[PDB]
Ligand binder design. Structure first.
Ligand SMILES: C[C@@H](NC(=O)[C@H](CS)NC(=O)CCC[C@H](N)C(=O)O)C(=O)O
Ligand SMILES: [Fe+2]
Length: 329
């Protein structure tokens, strides 16, 4: 008595090519999914997810407490005042089970103009010692570009779905300046599992992370094959099936803003499961000054009474608000 949500599997391979009629047939599927539950699995994506999972497991199981403090974001280590987003997010044994590592655009180097200007939401990534984690930084940086490619293709499908030219979103999603992030999250098996680390929903469901809409344009997520996510629907919360061969895709609240809620940002939550598993989201964020004029695909003239919002303003407000609502992660 918690039924499964309709989450279609869509073959996105035409989005990488030049068959325009085939791309329109993919765009139709994206439209349908975005108007129903808001979630779909992208299949035939070209990314080696098994390897991704293996490399990530090797990192999570070998990092030590010393390394974690040395990489910690400022919420856990006061000496690291520049690390708001990038770094290690520690667990608190007996109180908080989850732990994670976040990194941003590898092009945000010490000489990048936005780093020199000290613009909010831009940081230089921190990495563990190469001899303790051979090949990890290089793997993680190449993964960023692999998922960036998949995301650009997906944004082509969303633009066509909405009646726009294929580069409508993608032209604002650029290697030199995207604020996109990867998060490598570890959810542990624990015996006993501390009650303090388990939250409870109004409907009685045990949770690891409460209800929310994503802070993103779209979210491109790989998870282990253990069911955990739920989406709010007409008929209550419904289970999203796991599939550790595909990427789970949904719209974030910036997409909802731009489309006047034609494509809603679905409300979803993370169930508590006592299992050792991985959750590896890529948050598709645009540039700091990117602005798309809002429109409404349900209106004849397509006009909307929403005002333009720059991406940088959206993102900094969003990330802080999500911490205030659902806690530091
Ligand atoms: C999917 C994953 N959830 C999450 O990652 C949750 C909700 S979408 N996301 C966040 O807390 C936002 C992380 C932002 C990141 N630090 C950045 O600076 O860009 C999970 O819990 O499994
Ligand atoms: Fe989410």
């Amino acid at each position: 008595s918690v039924s499964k949500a309709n989450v279609p599997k869509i073959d996105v391979s035409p989005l990488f090519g030049d068959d325009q009629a085939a791309k329109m047939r993919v765009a139709q599927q994206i439209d349908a999914a975005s108007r129903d539950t808001g979630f779909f699995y992208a299949v035939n994506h070209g990314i080696n997810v098994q390897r991704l999972s293996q490399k990530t497991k090797e990192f999570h199981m070998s990092i030590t407490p010393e390394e974690k403090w040395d990489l910690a974001i400022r919420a856990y280590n006061k000496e690291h005042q520049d690390q708001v987003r990038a770094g290690y997010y520690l667990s608190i044994p007996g109180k908080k089970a989850v732990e994670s590592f976040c990194y941003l655009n590898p092009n945000f180097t010490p000489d990048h103009p936005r780093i020199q200007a000290k613009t909010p939401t831009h940081e230089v990534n921190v990495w563990p010692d190469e001899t303790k984690h051979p090949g990890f930084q290089d793997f993680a940086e190449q993964y960023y570009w692999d998922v960036f490619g998949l995301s650009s293709a997906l944004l082509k499908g969303y633009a066509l779905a909405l009646g726009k030219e294929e580069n409508f979103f993608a032209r604002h999603f650029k290697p030199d300046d995207t604020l996109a992030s990867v998060v490598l999250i570890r959810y542990p098996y624990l015996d006993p599992y501390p009650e303090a680390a388990i939250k409870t929903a109004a409907d009685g469901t045990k949770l690891s992370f409460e209800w929310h809409e994503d802070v993103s344009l779209i979210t491109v997520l790989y998870q282990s094959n253990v069911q955990n996510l739920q989406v709010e629907t007409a008929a209550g919360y419904q289970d999203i099936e796991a599939d550790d061969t595909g990427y789970l895709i949904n719209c974030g609240s910036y997409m909802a803003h731009l489309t006047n809620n034609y494509y809603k940002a679905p409300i979803h939550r993370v169930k508590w499961v006592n299992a050792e598993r991985q959750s590896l989201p890529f948050f598709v964020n645009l540039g700091y000054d990117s602005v798309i004029d809002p429109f409404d695909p349900r209106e004849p003239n397509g006009k909307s009474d929403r005002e333009p919002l720059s991406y940088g303003d959206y993102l900094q407000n969003g990330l802080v608000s999500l911490i205030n609502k659902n806690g530091q992660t």
